[PDB]
Design a protein around this ligand. Structure first.
Ligand SMILES: *[C@H](C)[C@H]1/C(=C/c2[nH]c(/C=C3N=C(/C=C4\NC(=O)C(CC)=C4C)C(C)=C\3CCC(=O)O)c(CCC(=O)O)c2C)NC(=O)[C@@H]1C
Ligand SMILES: *[C@H](C)[C@H]1/C(=C/c2[nH]c(/C=C3N=C(/C=C4\NC(=O)C(CC)=C4C)C(C)=C\3CCC(=O)O)c(CCC(=O)O)c2C)NC(=O)[C@@H]1C
Ligand SMILES: *[C@H](C)[C@H]1/C(=C/c2[nH]c(/C=C3N=C(/C=C4\NC(=O)C(CC)=C4C)C(C)=C\3CCC(=O)O)c(CCC(=O)O)c2C)NC(=O)[C@@H]1C
Ligand SMILES: *[C@H](C)[C@H]1/C(=C/c2[nH]c(/C=C3N=C(/C=C4\NC(=O)C(CC)=C4C)C(C)=C\3CCC(=O)O)c(CCC(=O)O)c2C)NC(=O)[C@@H]1C
Ligand SMILES: *[C@H](C)[C@H]1/C(=C/c2[nH]c(/C=C3N=C(/C=C4\NC(=O)C(CC)=C4C)C(C)=C\3CCC(=O)O)c(CCC(=O)O)c2C)NC(=O)[C@@H]1C
Ligand SMILES: *[C@H](C)[C@H]1/C(=C/c2[nH]c(/C=C3N=C(/C=C4\NC(=O)C(CC)=C4C)C(C)=C\3CCC(=O)O)c(CCC(=O)O)c2C)NC(=O)[C@@H]1C
Ligand SMILES: *[C@H](C)[C@H]1/C(=C/c2[nH]c(/C=C3N=C(/C=C4\NC(=O)C(CC)=C4C)C(C)=C\3CCC(=O)O)c(CCC(=O)O)c2C)NC(=O)[C@@H]1C
Ligand SMILES: *[C@H](C)[C@H]1/C(=C/c2[nH]c(/C=C3N=C(/C=C4\NC(=O)C(CC)=C4C)C(C)=C\3CCC(=O)O)c(CCC(=O)O)c2C)NC(=O)[C@@H]1C
Ligand SMILES: *[C@H](C)[C@H]1/C(=C/c2[nH]c(/C=C3N=C(/C=C4\NC(=O)C(CC)=C4C)C(C)=C\3CCC(=O)O)c(CCC(=O)O)c2C)NC(=O)[C@@H]1C
Ligand SMILES: *[C@H](C)[C@H]1/C(=C/c2[nH]c(/C=C3N=C(/C=C4\NC(=O)C(CC)=C4C)C(C)=C\3CCC(=O)O)c(CCC(=O)O)c2C)NC(=O)[C@@H]1C
Lengths: 97, 160, 64, 159, 160, 160, 159, 159, 160, 161, 161
């Protein structure tokens, strides 16, 4: 999961920022989907994708990380890029999942 | 979560009442305590690792728990227990700044008893550890801060 | 923030699965309040039945 | 509140409060006593602020209090004034909190949807809040007014 | 699912081939169909107003909207009108389908439990649904109204 | 049926039914009466269709009804005919629905796996369905036959 | 887990170093091991047939398969035979392991609850498991059968 | 810096800066001039602070400057002092910024990994920073010292 | 043990055990008796191995047994030796299992965290294990030593 | 990726040829080398942290890079550089077990030059570090293993160059 | 190209406005700076060869670049690099006289990045060389001139990077 959501390189640096999240998963009180949501709603995600990229490139990365694909068509680019404006990154991530 | 200031606001909002002097006095009380709390929080953050170490030494280690067949036996279990200790400390610090116990309920306290019972973690020993942390914290923070710090530690203990 | 604890069962109507997939069929999960609405709909659309909903964290009818 | 916001950011990061965050808390606690007085002033002048702002709004927008308009009629005009009163109460709460979060939960989320069902025009509501700000500013001292202005501006921005 | 499919499913569990009696029920549905389509279009066009009128009849000018009421605060108000919209949309779907099942699968499932945890008042919600029904009845006209009413009543009974 | 499909698309979009979608529903309800007649015809001729198709299948495949073959023996031959009857019943359901979905859920999902455990040859089953189609086509009028053919073809495609 | 690991774990909770008595238990397992491997290979090769025979004994020619029965429709039939395969594969794993724990960890845990929600009949499933056991017993031969039977019985008791 | 942090939070929310956020910015700009002086003081006393702290650290931890220890030898001792100097420079940067972010990027991310490769003990490094704090506090006025303390504490917390 | 490993791979693939995998299991069960003897040898020599290794470690690292150091004092020195004994017991368990998994669960997961709370230096612990390996190797025959070495090396790698 | 066994198979498959004695000989060669490689891999895994430490000491540290204004200055950059070193080591170990250089091309070598150029990481220094790791690794693995290990390290170095 | 005087004129021309006092003051500002700039330019022209030599000594030479396998290895490459350095110097001098950065954009800056990437010339090293030239130039020109000279050098550096 760390490698999917962050990239490989950033995932290496992770020591235990998410240790509390891991425990809830280990406990089987959260699902894997929920765990992926919360990795997305994280300062680390935001710092590594959102903050140094224009909003279009942000939608790319989100598609890559949460669905494994690029953006299929201009209508899809509109819908998601739209929602990223006028709401958080936390909204985008939440919509995909 | 909720804090002291927001708690007052919310009580007034359900009544629909504008803020009144009595309410203001409660807010004013918090504001005086605030400066002390900030100092205490900084102390705790800096000494957090040691606080946990000392508390473990007081209760957890050199005990049946650490000995084979004990709950905290094996490295994995030992590490888990000290991780939990850290959680309690961090949340108590948050609560102390906030001036409200609610955050403890919302994050730490909810479902913990049930989790521990399924795991077979001993609640009384955990409570003992929390009380030990409180004592260590009390020293570092100093007396005025200690009273404030103690209530949140006691709240955690009672919940568990 | 308010959290919802939800237990729901979803049957795999489209295809028989060789993998055990016990977790997918029957799941208890913690949902953020905002997410739950959408999640509830998605379970319904799947044809899964939500046996139980509880508010894990927060207070009901709290203004803040 | 300021403190709630800081704690929440820390919890997300799973870290103890940063020095900078702590400093902001310190500043807030010092400011609080002054803030309480500002809030108290507006509460006392609340009745007049609402009345004056209402009149200004109706002068600015004849349409709202016209047979077509939503505000028209005694019942409706009362409700419009009640709304202005609500927003003022929220602003006072905000000043003491030092953050718009208390205001935001009660008043700014779903506001568009609520008013659209009612068919009340959102811009007119904003004008009313602007009007209230001007009245409030006059009673407040300049520095106090600036603090109050920020909260008033947020409301106007939100709608 | 649908009236047509409901008949089919009942026969399938019996293992019976479709019979004339079954066919007659299907035939009955086919005649009603045209009316239903007209009703659905009316409802879709007037949906916003229907909700507005129903809210005016029951929800607003009430304790609920007043401070300390369930629908107090913008967030709660918006939630309640969103729920009203869903009931209307699903009832329209049910009317076209000729089957109550979709209401059970979509609306009715998990609603009661959600509402109880939230502390939303069921009776008030039911009142709102009944109000929508009355408004809808007018717009759709009498023949359509009877059909529309049953689905609204079904929703109300489920919530209660 | 078609109506269910339309509703489902609308629900996914969370929107009221589009005019175009509504029009398709109208067309389907008009078509239904004709569809019912086609289904009725096959139901009446069901016993003979199965019998004739069975004979054709056994002529086409001597092996299935041979000591080695699965179909061989009275019990087994009855079961093979029962299966043919089942598929015919499903086809009738399909015609009234106007969609293959009813057919598909009952008969086409996991069919390969079921027959492989039974050890029944899938191609022989397909031939039987083809045989049934030919018999059914003869009794049906040409336009009716074309409609029925589509459903029959789907079954043959599914069991391949 | 495994017989070998079970011995180890029992010693670890005691904190005792491995002793001859412990070694003897491990030695006992090692002798049985060769037989178990042969049995497992037999089961794997005949798995499809085992399921077929067991189904014939209990599941098919029954109300379940008839319309209105749980195993009616191709989808449900396929699901039931998939479940049967699971039980067989896990029992084979358990037999090699010499420990019932794997059955508890994977197969047995949550199955009852899943089945109750699904409306699958537990008693019929148990019947199928018992049928598989009988078929398996024949193929494996007597010495292997005793070992095989215990795991099948364990599954049945759990369900 | 304070301002960077505020902007970043706003951008994530996709909103204009909140009144509360704006207020914090105002407070920071007023504080800045005082902050600059505090930083200047520490810079001037830098050489002595490092020297005194080093001595204290070595007294507190004989082991680090022992044949086994990492710090032992002239080359190694110099490097240990250089590290202390680095951390002091970072703290000054932090005070002017009003936030730990500048400190954090240069010094606190990957610090564990770097020191683990070096085999330097992290707790000893923390003690050195604590020692530097005490020296720095003495030279600073009380209020100035408190401000400086927060940044020093953060560093100690980070390692 | 090894067999668990094989089963786990099969379960992931959702397949019955491969012939090759089965063969490896057969080889392991044959090897086990030899492995038991190797383990027995180390158990008998355990007391001396620990003692010798301890002395070597203390010579290698004077600091650990110094007033600053964690090991310093009789109580602490005993605990350090107890830890060495624990690791030796784990190694013996590993040899009989034929896998590091038994070792890993008890000793290598969370080890870093546990020692960091204790403040014990991890590299020194590793040296102690290395020292134990050298002593153990001498008592063991060459081929036996190689087998034992692998488990010892793993521990050293883990604590690193 | 591919391994030696699969590489032979794939070459034959494109030709459509059945496996022949010459091909068999290559496979046989691999099988003998295999046991040595497994031992080498275990050695490297256990000593990985130290290998990196030693190599850094030889080339990277006590240098302008670590000094302010150098690429490896700041903790974040230092940590990144040692992470990259670990990658090279892990992949080389994988390649050594496989007996094929292809994995290095598919994962490590592809896009590395471009990444480094954008980052401004100095290639020559990185190459130096890889060569240093090779030397340290050579010692630990022992001579027979060293020759095999060296080729993969050299392959990485040549790619980066 | 454009200069300061023409830039003011062009801005007014698009507006269609006659020259105004505010505009005149900007022109007046330039005229005072002009005399200094002319002196600086003459200094640079006379010392150009040395400036390049010193800057190369500071950054380019005695480095990996000059060593075999480096970009500036071989006489041909070395000569190319110093030719590029001369270009930058000449254009910066032109820009300083002009009082406008535009000429740098029109001649030097446009397409340079792409050219360098195809060539494999290292941009950061080139930037380093430009910065070195700036430092040398600063000394010769003297302080008042140096500030003016520095901005154009920085402009080149920013463009390349
Ligand atoms: C230490 C004082 C005692 C102790 C602790 C211990 N805890 C676990 C396991 C869990 N603890 C928690 C608790 C939390 N998870 C969270 O997210 C939070 C809030 C921030 C808390 C407090 C949970 C959920 C688990 C399960 C998974 C996990 O590893 O966290 C164990 C492990 C028990 C086991 O069988 O594995 C232990 C040992 N037990 C003691 O011995 C002390 C008395
Ligand atoms: C067959 C002997 C009887 C039978 C079986 C049956 N099962 C299902 C559906 C499911 N069964 C399971 C069980 C498991 N999942 C696992 O991971 C494991 C352990 C490895 C087991 C045993 C699950 C989860 C399902 C859900 C569907 C899925 O594909 O996962 C059905 C279908 C019922 C339905 O309507 O969905 C059936 C019929 N029932 C009988 O009648 C036989 C007696
Ligand atoms: C005045 C500036 C404008 C105006 C006001 C207006 N409001 C209503 C009706 C309602 N207004 C509210 C508002 C709130 N309820 C809340 O909980 C909050 C947050 C604290 C607010 C601000 C509500 C809920 C109602 C519904 C009625 C009720 O309260 O029971 C009306 C009447 C419209 C109607 O049909 O009811 C009017 C006229 N109208 C304008 O055009 C002015 C610009
Ligand atoms: C309005 C007539 C009454 C009312 C409604 C009300 N509902 C909520 C919150 C929720 N209601 C739902 C319900 C649904 N979710 C679904 O998926 C469906 C089927 C389409 C329904 C009907 C849910 C899930 C929520 C929680 C989150 C959300 O917004 O969806 C509230 C807010 C309560 C709170 O404490 O926040 C309210 C007010 N309550 C009334 O006052 C009316 C009588
Ligand atoms: C005839 C074309 C071929 C044939 C048939 C055959 N079938 C069986 C046994 C079964 N067939 C079914 C099939 C279904 N059950 C369902 O619910 C459905 C979907 C509606 C189907 C199609 C089943 C489940 C059985 C088991 C018995 C039962 O259901 O009671 C046999 C007997 C073999 C056996 O071992 O039972 C035979 C012979 N065999 C051929 O070779 C023909 C080509
Ligand atoms: C000796 C090589 C080094 C050393 C040892 C040392 N250990 C402790 C304290 C403890 N050690 C453990 C470790 C374990 N618990 C387990 O379950 C396992 C795996 C089976 C191990 C290895 C524990 C639990 C403790 C805590 C105390 C207790 O016994 O309950 C100390 C004492 C320090 C302290 O603060 O307790 C020491 C000195 N330290 C060195 O310096 C040597 C290099
Ligand atoms: C002193 C408190 C403790 C100590 C210090 C110590 N450090 C080194 C070597 C290095 N330290 C660094 C650290 C940094 N580089 C940075 O960019 C930053 C952030 C601005 C830091 C903190 C580096 C890179 C090195 C490597 C050498 C180099 O700079 O090229 C040593 C030498 C040991 C070694 O193996 O090199 C020492 C001794 N260690 C202690 O024991 C003291 C308690
Ligand atoms: C170490 C010898 C040199 C060094 C390294 C260094 N690397 C980075 C940053 C990155 N390095 C990589 C490389 C890889 N990612 C991969 O997937 C692979 C193949 C498996 C490799 C080799 C990547 C992609 C990054 C960027 C993202 C990240 O940092 O994780 C840095 C940081 C540079 C920066 O500007 O941030 C450094 C310092 N530094 C030297 O100078 C040494 C010569
Ligand atoms: C010796 C006969 C004369 C002499 C030599 C001299 N050379 C330098 C410095 C350099 N000379 C070169 C030459 C080459 N680099 C290449 O790529 C090639 C072809 C492969 C050649 C021939 C270079 C590049 C340098 C610069 C040094 C560097 O590597 O950075 C010096 C030193 C002067 C200085 O300031 O560097 C000297 C003394 N000097 C004489 O007068 C002799 C007649
Ligand atoms: C010196 C600081 C660096 C360096 C330079 C270098 N450049 C080339 C080759 C070319 N340089 C240019 C550049 C320009 N042409 C223009 O029009 C402009 C804008 C005014 C510039 C700056 C061109 C076009 C060439 C190619 C044709 C030619 O040589 O005339 C080389 C040679 C590259 C080769 O592989 O042959 C070099 C070495 N390289 C360094 O090492 C320094 C960082």
């Amino acid at each position: 999961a760390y490698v999917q959501v962050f990239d490989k390189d950033i995932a290496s640096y992770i020591r235990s920022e998410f240790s509390a999240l891991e425990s809830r998963l280990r406990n089987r009180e959260t699902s894997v989907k929920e765990f992926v949501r919360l990795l997305g709603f994280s300062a680390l995600y935001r710092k590594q994708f959102h903050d140094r990229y224009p909003n279009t490139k942000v939608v790319e990365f989100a598609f890559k990380h949460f669905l494994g694909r690029a953006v299929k068509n201009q209508a899809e680019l509109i819908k998601y890029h739209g929602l990223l404006g006028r709401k958080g990154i936390k909204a985008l991530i939440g919509a995909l999942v | 979560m909720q804090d002291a200031i927001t708690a007052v606001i919310n009580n007034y909002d359900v009544q629909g009442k504008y803020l009144d002097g009595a309410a203001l006095d409660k807010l004013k009380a918090y504001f005086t305590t605030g400066a002390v709390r900030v100092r205490a929080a900084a102390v705790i953050s800096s000494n957090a690792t040691t606080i946990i170490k000392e508390a473990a030494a007081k209760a957890l280690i050199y005990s049946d728990l650490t000995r084979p067949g004990g709950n905290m036996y094996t490295t994995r279990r030992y590490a888990a227990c000290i991780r939990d200790m850290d959680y309690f400390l961090r949340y108590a610090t948050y609560a102390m700044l906030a001036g409200d116990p609610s955050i403890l309920d919302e994050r730490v306290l909810n479902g913990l008893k049930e989790t521990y019972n399924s795991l077979g973690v001993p609640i009384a020993a955990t409570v003992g550890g929390i009380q030990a942390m409180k004592e260590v914290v009390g020293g570092l923070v100093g007396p005025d801060a200690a009273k404030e710090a103690s209530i949140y530690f006691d709240y955690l203990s009672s919940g568990l | 923030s308010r959290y919802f604890k939800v237990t729901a069962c979803i049957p795999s109507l489209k295809r028989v699965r060789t993998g055990r997939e016990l977790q997918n069929t029957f799941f208890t999960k913690l949902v953020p309040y905002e997410n739950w609405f959408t999640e509830q709909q998605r379970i319904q659309k799947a044809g899964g039945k939500v046996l139980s909903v509880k508010l894990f964290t927060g207070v009901q009818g709290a203004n803040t | 509140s300021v403190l709630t916001k800081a704690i929440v950011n820390a919890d997300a990061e799973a870290r103890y409060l940063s020095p900078g965050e702590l400093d902001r808390i310190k500043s807030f606690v010092a400011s609080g006593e002054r803030r309480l007085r500002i809030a108290q002033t507006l509460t006392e002048a609340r009745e007049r602020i609402v009345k004056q702002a209402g009149d200004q709004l109706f002068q600015k927008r004849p349409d709202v209090v016209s047979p077509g308009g939503n505000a028209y009629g005694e019942k409706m005009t009362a409700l419009c004034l009640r709304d202005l009163d609500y927003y003022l109460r929220l602003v006072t709460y905000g000043i003491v909190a030092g953050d718009v979060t208390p205001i935001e939960e009660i008043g700014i989320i779903g506001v568009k949807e609520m008013y659209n069902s009612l068919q009340t025009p959102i811009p007119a509501v904003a004008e009313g809040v602007r009007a209230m700000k001007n009245v409030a500013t006059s009673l407040l001292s300049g520095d106090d007014a600036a603090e109050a202005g920020f909260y008033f501006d947020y409301l106007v921005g939100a709608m």
